[PDB]
Amino acid sequence: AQDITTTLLHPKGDHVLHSHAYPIFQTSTFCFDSTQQGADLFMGKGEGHIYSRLGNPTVEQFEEMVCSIEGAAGSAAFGSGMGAISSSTLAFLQKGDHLIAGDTLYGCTVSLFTHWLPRFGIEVDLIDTSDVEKVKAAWKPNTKMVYLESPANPTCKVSDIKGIAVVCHERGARLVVDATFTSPCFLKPLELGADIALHSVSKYINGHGDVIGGVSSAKTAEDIATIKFYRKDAGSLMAPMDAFLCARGMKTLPIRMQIHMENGLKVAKFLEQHEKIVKVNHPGLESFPGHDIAKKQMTGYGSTFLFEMKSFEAAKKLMEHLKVCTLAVSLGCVDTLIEHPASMTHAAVPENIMRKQGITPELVRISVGIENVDDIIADLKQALELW
Amino acid sequence: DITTTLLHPKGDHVLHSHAYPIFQTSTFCFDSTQQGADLFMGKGEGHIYSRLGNPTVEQFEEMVCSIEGAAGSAAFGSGMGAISSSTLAFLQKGDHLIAGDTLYGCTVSLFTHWLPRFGIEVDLIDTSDVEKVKAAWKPNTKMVYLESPANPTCKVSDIKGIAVVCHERGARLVVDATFTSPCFLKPLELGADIALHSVSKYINGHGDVIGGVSSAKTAEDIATIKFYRKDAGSLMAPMDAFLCARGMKTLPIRMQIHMENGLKVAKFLEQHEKIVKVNHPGLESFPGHDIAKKQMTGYGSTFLFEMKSFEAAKKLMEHLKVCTLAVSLGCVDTLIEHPASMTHAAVPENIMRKQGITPELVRISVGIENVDDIIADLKQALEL
Amino acid sequence: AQDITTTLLHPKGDHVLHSHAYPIFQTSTFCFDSTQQGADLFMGKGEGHIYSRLGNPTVEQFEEMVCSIEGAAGSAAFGSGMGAISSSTLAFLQKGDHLIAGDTLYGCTVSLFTHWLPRFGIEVDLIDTSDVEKVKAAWKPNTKMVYLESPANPTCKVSDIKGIAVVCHERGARLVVDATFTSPCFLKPLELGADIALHSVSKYINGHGDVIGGVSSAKTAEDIATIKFYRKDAGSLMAPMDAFLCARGMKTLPIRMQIHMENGLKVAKFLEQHEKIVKVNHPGLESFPGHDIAKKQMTGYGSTFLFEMKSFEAAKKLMEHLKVCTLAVSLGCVDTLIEHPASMTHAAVPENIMRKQGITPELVRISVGIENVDDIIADLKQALEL
Amino acid sequence: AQDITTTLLHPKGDHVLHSHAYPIFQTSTFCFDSTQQGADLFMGKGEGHIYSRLGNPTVEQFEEMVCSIEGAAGSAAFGSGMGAISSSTLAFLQKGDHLIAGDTLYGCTVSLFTHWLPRFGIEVDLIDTSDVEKVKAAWKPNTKMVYLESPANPTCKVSDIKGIAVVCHERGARLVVDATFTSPCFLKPLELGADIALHSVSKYINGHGDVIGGVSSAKTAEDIATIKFYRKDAGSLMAPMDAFLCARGMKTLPIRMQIHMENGLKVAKFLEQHEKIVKVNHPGLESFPGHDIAKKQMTGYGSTFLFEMKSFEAAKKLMEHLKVCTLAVSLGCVDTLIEHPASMTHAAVPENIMRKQGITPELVRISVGIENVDDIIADLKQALELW
Numbered sequence A, D: 001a002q003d004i005t006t007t008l009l010h011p012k013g014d015h016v017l018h019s020h021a022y023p024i025f026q027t028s029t030f031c032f033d034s035t036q037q038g039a040d041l042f043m044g045k046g047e048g049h050i051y052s053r054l055g056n057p058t059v060e061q062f063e064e065m066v067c068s069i070e071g072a073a074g075s076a077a078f079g080s081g082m083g084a085i086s087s088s089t090l091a092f093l094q095k096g097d098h099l100i101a102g103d104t105l106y107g108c109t110v111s112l113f114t115h116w117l118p119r120f121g122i123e124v125d126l127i128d129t130s131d132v133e134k135v136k137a138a139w140k141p142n143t144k145m146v147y148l149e150s151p152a153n154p155t156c157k158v159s160d161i162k163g164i165a166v167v168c169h170e171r172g173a174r175l176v177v178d179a180t181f182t183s184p185c186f187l188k189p190l191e192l193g194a195d196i197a198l199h200s201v202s203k204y205i206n207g208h209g210d211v212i213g214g215v216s217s218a219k220t221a222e223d224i225a226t227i228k229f230y231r232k233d234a235g236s237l238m239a240p241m242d243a244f245l246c247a248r249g250m251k252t253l254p255i256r257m258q259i260h261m262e263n264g265l266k267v268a269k270f271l272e273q274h275e276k277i278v279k280v281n282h283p284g285l286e287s288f289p290g291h292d293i294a295k296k297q298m299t300g301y302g303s304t305f306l307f308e309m310k311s312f313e314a315a316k317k318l319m320e321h322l323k324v325c326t327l328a329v330s331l332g333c334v335d336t337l338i339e340h341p342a343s344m345t346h347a348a349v350p351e352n353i354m355r356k357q358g359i360t361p362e363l364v365r366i367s368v369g370i371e372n373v374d375d376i377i378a379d380l381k382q383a384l385e386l387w
Numbered sequence B: 001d002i003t004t005t006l007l008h009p010k011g012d013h014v015l016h017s018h019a020y021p022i023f024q025t026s027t028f029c030f031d032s033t034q035q036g037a038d039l040f041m042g043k044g045e046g047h048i049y050s051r052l053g054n055p056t057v058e059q060f061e062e063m064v065c066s067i068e069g070a071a072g073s074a075a076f077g078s079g080m081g082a083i084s085s086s087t088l089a090f091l092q093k094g095d096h097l098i099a100g101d102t103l104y105g106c107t108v109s110l111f112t113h114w115l116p117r118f119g120i121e122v123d124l125i126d127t128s129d130v131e132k133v134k135a136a137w138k139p140n141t142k143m144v145y146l147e148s149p150a151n152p153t154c155k156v157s158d159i160k161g162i163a164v165v166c167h168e169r170g171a172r173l174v175v176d177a178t179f180t181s182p183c184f185l186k187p188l189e190l191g192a193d194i195a196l197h198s199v200s201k202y203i204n205g206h207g208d209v210i211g212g213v214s215s216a217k218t219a220e221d222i223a224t225i226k227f228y229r230k231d232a233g234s235l236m237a238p239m240d241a242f243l244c245a246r247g248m249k250t251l252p253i254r255m256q257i258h259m260e261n262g263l264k265v266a267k268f269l270e271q272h273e274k275i276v277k278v279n280h281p282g283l284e285s286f287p288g289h290d291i292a293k294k295q296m297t298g299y300g301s302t303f304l305f306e307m308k309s310f311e312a313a314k315k316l317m318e319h320l321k322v323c324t325l326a327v328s329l330g331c332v333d334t335l336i337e338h339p340a341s342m343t344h345a346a347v348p349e350n351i352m353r354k355q356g357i358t359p360e361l362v363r364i365s366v367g368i369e370n371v372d373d374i375i376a377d378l379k380q381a382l383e384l
Numbered sequence C: 001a002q003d004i005t006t007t008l009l010h011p012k013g014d015h016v017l018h019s020h021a022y023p024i025f026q027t028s029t030f031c032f033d034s035t036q037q038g039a040d041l042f043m044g045k046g047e048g049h050i051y052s053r054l055g056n057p058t059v060e061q062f063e064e065m066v067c068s069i070e071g072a073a074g075s076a077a078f079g080s081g082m083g084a085i086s087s088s089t090l091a092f093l094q095k096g097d098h099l100i101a102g103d104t105l106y107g108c109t110v111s112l113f114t115h116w117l118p119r120f121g122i123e124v125d126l127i128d129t130s131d132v133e134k135v136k137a138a139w140k141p142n143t144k145m146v147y148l149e150s151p152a153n154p155t156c157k158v159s160d161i162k163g164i165a166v167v168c169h170e171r172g173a174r175l176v177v178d179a180t181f182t183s184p185c186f187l188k189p190l191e192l193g194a195d196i197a198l199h200s201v202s203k204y205i206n207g208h209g210d211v212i213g214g215v216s217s218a219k220t221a222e223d224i225a226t227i228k229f230y231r232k233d234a235g236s237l238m239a240p241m242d243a244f245l246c247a248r249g250m251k252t253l254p255i256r257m258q259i260h261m262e263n264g265l266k267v268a269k270f271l272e273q274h275e276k277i278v279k280v281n282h283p284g285l286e287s288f289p290g291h292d293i294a295k296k297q298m299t300g301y302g303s304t305f306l307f308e309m310k311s312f313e314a315a316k317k318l319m320e321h322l323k324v325c326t327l328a329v330s331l332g333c334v335d336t337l338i339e340h341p342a343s344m345t346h347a348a349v350p351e352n353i354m355r356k357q358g359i360t361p362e363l364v365r366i367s368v369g370i371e372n373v374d375d376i377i378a379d380l381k382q383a384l385e386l
C-alpha cells in the first residue's frame, strides 16, 4: 500500500498541456464544441466542463486529493468550513426532521444550528455526545442526522464516533463528522462509520493561514451528488486560486501533521507539569477523559488544545507576553497561535451552552505550529515566569 | 460621472500602495486580549478573520455600495450565494414568497426545490403585471423577488409599482439586476429593499471570476445578510475581489459599448428574414419597453431571439467564428447559448412553458468587439 | 479587416480544456512523454513546452496579443520595461560597437546607456534625434544601432522615426523604438521602418497600475530569436500571473486609449489657456514643435505630457493640493497621476544630460486617466486658484 | 540560539493592517505624501516605497527571509536563477576583467559565461575548481572573480569553497557561489568565505515546482546595493505573487530539506548496490571523490544526483517506465523528477565542455522528492527489473 505522502504528491488525473503543476483555471465559463456536446454535459452525459460553479478543473483536483485521503465516494470544496457545514446538513435536513448535535462545537456552527436551522422548521438538540446513552435518550422517530465534532473545538471533548455510528446505522440517520481539529491524516470518520466527513480547510489541510475554505466528503455517490446539488444553489464555492493554494498546502500535510502532533504533545506535557497551569485538555494525555476513545479511533492528534490558568489575569499576562506565539484566532497554521475562547472564538455562544461547554475566562487555547518545539516551550516558559 | 467614483474609492492606502493590496490571509493578529475582545463585540476599528471581513473584499463591497446608493454591500462566492443569502436570511417556516415566473435556471431550482423544504411557501407569478402580484398576495407574504429584465426572455417587471405594493403591505422587495448592471438599473433607487448581482457577469466583465454581491437599503438588513453569510459561508476570495474591483474600473465604459452594440445587433436581427422575433428591452416592438425606458437609464447587451426551427438555431450557433458557444453572459467577448437545452434545461416543464422557452430560442450576450465584426459573423452564419 | 478590438478579444491559439479564459500556468517545469520527445523539444523539433524560462503558455498568449497589434514576426515578454530595453540592446551590441540614442529618455534608460553599456565596451552617444541630420553627423563606422523614444519621457520631444529608419537601413544599423508613451494602438514603429518596437507594459498596455512588465517585438524571426536567447540567460521573465493580468488589461486597451487620448488633449488645451502656465508640451497641440511629424507618423496620442509652472514653489503648490490626481511616479494607469521629474523620475540623470534634456524644477508631468475629464479639469482649476 | 525553522516562520517586520499572512502588493506604483517626501525617497532618505522595480513590500519580505538564513548583509530577489546569476556577475565584471568559473555548471550558466560575457570584453576561463592548484594556475593580474557551483549540476562535483576563498581574499577577487543544489539549510557560502551566495529559488527554496525565481545575498551592504542597482536597470524582478509563493514555500524549507536529504541518501544507496547501476555520484556517499570536503563544508546534502547505467538504452528503459518519478527537467520539487542530461539539461553545452564535464548518454539525473522513500525505491526497482 502506497503511503499517503506519495498519494497526495501523485494525484489521479491527466496533466494539462504537459504542465507539471496543475494550472489555475481562473475562468467563469467553458466553450462547447457543438450544441449537442453542451446539451449532453448539462444532462451529465460525456466528459468536460460547463461553468465553474458546476465544476472547475483546479477545484476538482483539490477535491480528488481530499477524497483519496478520506476514502470517500467524492468530495466537494467550498468557500469556507461553514459553507461545507451548511451544505452537509441543509442539503439533507428539511422541515419536520430532527438533528442531534454535540453540545461543544465551533461557535458559528452553534450559531447555524441554533439560529438558522429552527427558522427552517428543523428541530435541533445539542447533546453531550461523549455519552452514547444520552444520544440514544435524545433520539426521536424523526431523527435524521447526528452531527459530531471530536475532539471538540475548543475543549477537545471526545465523542465515541464508532458507538454513535452503530445507532445512526440502525435507525436510518446520517452521521456527519467535523474532523477539522485532527486532519484526515489522523481521523478518518468514513472508516469509523460516518456518512460524511468535513473540514475547515482553512486550518491544517491548507496549513499556511492564507486561505479560507471548506471540504466535505461522502461515503456514497448519491450523498456527494446531493451535496454538490445544494452547493450549486447555495453558492459557497472554492475559488480557483484558493484551490491551487489548498492543493499546494496539502502537498506537505502528512509531514506537517507529524510535526504538529509531536510538538503539541510535548507542549502539552510541559504545560501539564508547570506550577501556573491548573489543567491541560489535550486528548493524547493519559489524564484526559476520553483519551482511551481518542487513541483507539484516531491514528494521531492535532496540536490545538486548551489549558486552564489560575485566573483570567494570569491568562492575559501569559497571552500578551509571548514572542513566538501569535495572539489571533484560527488554528492549524505552520506558526503557533494562541487565543482566549471566552472573549473571542466562543464569545457569541449563548450563556447556557457556554457553561454546558465548560468555557471559563481562565482558559487559553493554543494551536501549536511547526517551529522548533524547544523555542515554543522557551517562549511559554519565559512568559509564565514573568515578574 | 460613475467612472471617477469607481477609480477613486474612499479609504486609506495600505503602506502608500497605489493598487489596493491582496489580503490573501485567513486571520488577523491582536495587539492585546482587550483589543481582540473589543473587535468581537464590534467596538473599535480592525479585522479578525477573513470570513467576518477581509480588507480586499471590503474595498470591492464599498465600490458597489457607492454605486447602488446602499447602506452597505456584501460580496459572495457566486451570484447564487448572494441570492440565497438575500432571501433565506429573511424568510422562515410559515412565510410566503412571490417570485417572478421567469428567472435564471438555478434561482428556479432554489425557490422551487430548497425553499419549500424549509417550509417557505413560494408562488412564481407574472410580475410584468402588478395586479397579478396583488392577487397572489397572502397574509403571510414577506417578500417579492424579481429579475428585470428577466433571464433569458428579458420580460420587464414594474419595480417602482411593485415596491409601492411591498411598502404598503410589509414585505421586502429584492431585485436581481444582473442583466443590466448598476450603471443602468439601481433598484434601491426605485423603492426596492435589496439589489443583487451575479458579479460573474458585467460587473467583473472579464469572464475569469465567479462572484456575487448584495446591497441593502438599511443598515439592519445588510447586517442580517452578513450575519447569514458568516454561517452559510459563501465568501468572495481575496484574489477574486482584487479581480472584481479591477474589472469594475472599466465598468461604466464597457456598459456604454455593451449597450450600443446590443441595440445595433438586436436591430440587425430584427430585420433579418431568418429571425422570427427579438426580445430586447430597448426595442420599440418589445412589450415592456415603456416601463424599462422609464425605470432604467440604459440597457444590458444580453437578449433572446427566435429562429424558425431547432435545426435553424443549431446551424446558426454552430457556424459562428467570433461569437463563442458557451453559457454565462456579460463578458468582454460575445457569447451565445441555447436556453432550452443549456441554462434552463432543468426548469420544470410547466414552469418552462409559463416562461415561454422553446427549442427555437437562441440567447446572445453581445461583447465590446467592433459591432460590424459581430454583425458580419452572425450574417455569414445565418446566410451560409 | 477585422478590427483591433475584436483581434485582442479573439487571440489565436486553441483553448486549454475548453476553458474560456486562458489558464494561468503557474508552473516551472513540464512533463515529457518519452526521452525522445524531451530531446526533440530541446532541439526545437515538435510542439510543446519544457520549462517556463524557455516558454510558458500563459506568457506566450500575451506575447501573441502584442505581436498581433505590432505586426511583428514575434514578441518577447519580460519582468519589466527595463528588461525589455536591456534585452533589446545588449542582445545585439557588443564591445567595440557604437550606439546612438535620443538625448531625452526615461531616467533608468539613461542609467543603462550611460553607466552599464560603456563598462561592456560599447560606445554611446546621446544626441538630439528630433533632427535627422544630427543623427547623420553622429554616425561612425562602428554604429550598429539607433535607440529612440518618441514622444520622449518626459518632455514629449518627437523624432522622425521614419526618416531615421531610412538612414539605419542605408547604413546597416538596427532601429529600436520605445513606444511606451503612445501604446501600440497609436504608434507602430515596425510600420515606420523600425527593427524593434518595445514597451513598458507597466503603463498603458496593462493600464491598471498593478503590474510591472516589458515587451519587445521584432520585424524578423531571427531578431526575436536572438532576444529570447538573451532573455534565457539574462532572466528577466514575465510571471505567469502577471501575463494573465497583462492580457486581461489589454482586452480594454483600445477603448482605454481612445479615452486617454481625448481626455489628455482636453486637459492640455485647458492648461495651455490658463494664466498660471508658461507652456504645455503635448505633441497633439498645434503649438508644439514636431506636432506635424507626430500627426503623420502616429494614429493618436498618449495622455502623458509635461507643462511649465512660473516657479518651483508654484509647481509644489499645485502638485500638493490636488484631490483626484495622485502624486506618484509611473503613467498610463486608469487614474490620473502627477509627478515632478527634476526630483523624481529624472533625479538621477547627470546635470550634463539634464541640461540637454530641458528639465527644470518648474516642470510638472501629468498622466491623464480615464476619469470624467471634467473632474480632472475641476481638480486642476481648484488647485491653481489658491 | 533560535532554530532556523522558527526564524523562517517569524520573519522580522511589521504586520500590514494586522494581517497574519503578509499581503500581496500587486501594485506598480506607490503614493507620496508630498513632493519633499517623494524627493527624499529618491535620494534614499526616509522609510517608504516608490515603485515595485525599485522595491516591493511582498518581495522585500522574501528577501529578508533568505538574508536571515544566509547570514548576509542583504538579499535581492529576481525573476529567475539566471537573473540572479547575471546580476551577481555583470554588476561587478567589466571589460578587461577576468573571471575564473567552474567547468561543470548549469547549462545556461555556461551559455551566459561563454557567449555573453566575452561579447562584453570580459575574459573567462572554465577551470576544474575541485583542484585549488588549478585555480591558482589560472589566476591573472586582472582576475576579479571566481564563480563556483558545488556540488555541480549535474555531476555533483565538489569544490573546496573554503580553500578557494583564501586565494580570493588574498588577491582581491570576489567569490560567488551558486548553492541551488544544496539549499541554504545545508550550504552557507558566506560562512565559508564567499562574498555572494545565490540560488535558483525555482528549485528547493520554493520547493513546489510552481515558480521561477532567483535570489542573491551579499556579505557586504555595498555589494548588495550594487547588485540592486544592476537589477533596476537590467530588470529581472520577482513578481509580487511569485514572492508571496516563494515565502510560503520557504516556510517548510527546513523540514522538506531534512526529508529530501534522508530520501536522497537512501535512494543513492539502493542504486549503488543495484546490479544494473555502474556508479552513483551522490556527494554523501563514501565512494564519492569529494565526499570528505562536502562533509566538512556542508551540514547536509540536497537530493539531486546522478547515476550511470550500462547503456543509453538501459537509461531510457528506466526513465520511461517509472510510475511515481516524473520525466522532466528541473529539481528540488516535493515530488521526484528524473531527466537525461546528455539529451536535455546539458544538450546545449559545447562538446569541448561536455567531454570534460564527464557527461555521457549513460547518465541519468534524479531529483528525489519527499514521497515515502520505500515507494520511490519500489518504483525504481520495478523499472530496473523489467522484462
Ligand SMILES: CSCC/C(=N\Cc1c(COP(=O)(O)O)cnc(C)c1O)C(=O)O
Residues within 6 Å of the ligand: A080, A081, A082, A083, A106, A107, A108, A149, A153, A178, A180, A181, A199, A200, A201, A202, A212, A213, A214, A329, A330, A331, A344, A345, A346, B049, B051, B233
Ligand atoms: C470565531 S473565528 C475563528 C475561526 C475558527 N474555527 C473555524 C472552524 C470551522 C469554520 O471554518 P471556516 O472558518 O468557515 O473555514 C469549522 N469547524 C471547526 C472545527 C472550526 O474550528 C477558530 O478559531 O476556532
Ligand SMILES: CSCC/C(=N\Cc1c(COP(=O)(O)O)cnc(C)c1O)C(=O)O
Residues within 6 Å of the ligand: A050, A051, A053, A054, A235, B078, B079, B080, B081, B104, B106, B147, B151, B176, B178, B179, B197, B198, B199, B200, B210, B211, B212, B327, B328, B329, B343
Ligand atoms: C450554469 S449557467 C451560467 C450562469 C448564467 N447566469 C447566472 C445568473 C445568476 C447566478 O450567478 P452565479 O452564476 O452564481 O455567479 C444570478 N442571476 C442571474 C440573472 C444570472 O443570469 C447564465 O448563463 O444565464
Ligand SMILES: CSCC/C(=N\Cc1c(COP(=O)(O)O)cnc(C)c1O)C(=O)O
Residues within 6 Å of the ligand: C080, C081, C082, C083, C106, C107, C108, C149, C153, C178, C180, C181, C199, C200, C201, C202, C212, C213, C214, C329, C330, C331, C344, C345, C346, D051, D053, D235
Ligand atoms: C522613476 S520610476 C517610474 C517609472 C516610469 N517610467 C518607466 C519607463 C520605462 C521602464 O519600464 P519599467 O518601469 O521597467 O516597466 C521604459 N520606457 C519608458 C518610456 C518609461 O517611461 C515613469 O514614471 O516615468
Ligand code: MET
Residues within 6 Å of the ligand: C051, C054, D106, D108, D153, D329, D330, D331, D344, D345
Ligand atoms: C533549460 S533546463 C532548466 C531546469 C534546471 N536548471 C535543471 O537543471 O534542470
